[PDB]
Amino acid sequence: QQITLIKDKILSDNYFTLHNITYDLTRKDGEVIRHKREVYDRGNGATILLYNTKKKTVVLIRQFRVATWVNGNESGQLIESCAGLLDNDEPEVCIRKEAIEETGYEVGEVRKLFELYMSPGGVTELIHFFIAEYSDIEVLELPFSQALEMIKTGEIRDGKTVLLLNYLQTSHLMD
Template identity: 55%
Template sequence: MNAINITSTEILSDSWYTLKKISFEITANDGTKSTQEREAYDRGNGATILLYNRSNKTVVLTRQFRMPTFINGNETGYLIESCAGLLDKDNAEDCIKKETEEETGFRIDKVQKVFEAYMSPGSVTEIVYFFTAEYTNEMKVHEGGGLIEENEHIEVLELPFGKAIDMITTGEIKDGKTIMLLQHALINKLMG
């Protein structure tokens, strides 16, 4: 492994989240050293969940506007996604239970952690914790939609599992975390 020595860190932006420019010296295995610079966007860590109903063979997803996709060619700016949120000061399990209720209206007690992943390690520090949980209609405590004070306008979607899988192929679902969770459900036969 190469030895890394951070020589300086400069904050380029601290508005929505923090963008830093990091200068570092890297020593290769043969002993040669080079100086490099990278920018890293720190938005904190997150959690995401796939809610599934085994007997109905359905999943609950959300649809919301995402500005970065809009400026990168997503005509409407809306993405279909698995429920997710930033950890803030919560642990991943507490965070995803809270986000699930806020965004989807389902109150869940039991979640299963399936893995964790860096989603864009070349530029973003975030690690995302992935969960699944079974849901029933009895767990619905309100309509969901997110928090008004956080300017969230989230549409809750309950879709047949097979249709959700097909939506990956058609390009209707393009969100990486959602694709990973749907494929996890398919590979591990969560629908039976």
């Protein structure tokens, strides 16, 4: 219930900011218990899945991700849905803009899905999720069903990407 901020210690502020936050929780009859956690703030982002109900395909993005490279992704290439850190603007604008610039497709009306914390134990990151129809950074158009199999094989292994493809499966918008 009651949370009190005790200390905000900056551990690094190179570009993003890492904090050690000292804080106090009250247990029931407080019984105030002190905790101290690292918190990483890279701001919030948005992501969008592009899909074609006609030829039954989706558009996805492949690029080198260094944080995967030093942690078991041998070549470091990661297949992901289009995405980007939010700039100083409404989320709906930034994502339209990422989609054009990363994929080269012009995108119609977007649909807002939800806003999710992707890794809330130590990162603040909130992502806004969107889907839309459509008609170096490697641009992959591939059939929906191949994308879905790629999940099962481990070839797609990006949390937000799997989440989107799964959402799209259950939407039946591809049915």
